[PDB]
Amino acid sequence: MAVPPTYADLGESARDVFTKGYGFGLIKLDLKTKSENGLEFTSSGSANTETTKVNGSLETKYRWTEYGLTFTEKWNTDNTLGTEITVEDQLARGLKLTFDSSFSPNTGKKNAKIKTGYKREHINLGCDVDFDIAGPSIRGALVLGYEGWLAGYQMNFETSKSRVTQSNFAVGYKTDEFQLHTNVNDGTEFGGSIYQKVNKKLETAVNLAWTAGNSNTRFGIAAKYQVDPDACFSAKVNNSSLIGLGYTQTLKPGIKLTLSALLDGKNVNAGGHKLGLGLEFQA
Secondary structure, eight states: OOSOOOGGGTTHHHHHHTTTTOOTTEEEEEEEOOOSSEEEEEEEEEEETTTOOEEEEOOEEEEETTTTEEEEEOOOSSSOOOEEEEEESSSSTTEEEEEEEEOOTTTTOOEEEEEEEEEETTEEEEEEEEEETTEEEEEEEEEEOBTTEEEEEEEEEETTTTEEEEEEEEEEEEOSSEEEEEEEETTTEEOOEEEEOOSTTEEEEEEEEEETTOSOEEEEEEEEEOOSSSOEEEEEEESSSEEEEEEEEEEETTEEEEEEEEEETTOTTSSOOOEEEEEEEBO
């Protein structure tokens, strides 16, 4: 709808074409549970192919759909803690405000954070303040809208240094099928994305990136085809001679299997090529 997206979600569609369906060198195992009322949990467990390390994760999330409340815990592997309370669409439509905290009983480190955001027609703001140790920081954002045309700007002020350390501006055109997005970071890194919803079964994305004022540039192209209403195929290739492939297959209503393989030119096949096995298991 005419509400402009969050600045952190600009180009989100073209980003996932280069992201979802892949997972090299990391055997990821998850387990999701669906329930709009009550709560939902999801566990995770990624085993590293290289460093044979194991990393688990938990995430319980209660939801009060009658008041917008949404609690959350995590308790990561390396003794990392964290809670989160969310309230939205209560004072007005649509204001969102959350709370956050963290812990680390490894050596005694804490961290707090607050988020904020307001969205309407053609207007979408969002501020974030984190009360981290030795660095309170403010992070605001702004996105406007005008007949598909849509511009944005993000700020990141830091208080211990009393200076702004990051300023990003973005302009783009986004309709229901065609989507363009360009980005600039500190007047140095320049972005670029094009999303093409060709047919009912084909998606196409291209990205661009370069550093100023350098001569070299980095680019890549990706696609996702929906073979079967259960399976799909993903393929991406860039300028560094890397050709990553993916394949998602639904073995059972609620169980999907993802297998991926990263190839490195010009050694196909010769040297070390990273692979992975992602197995979804939603309940």
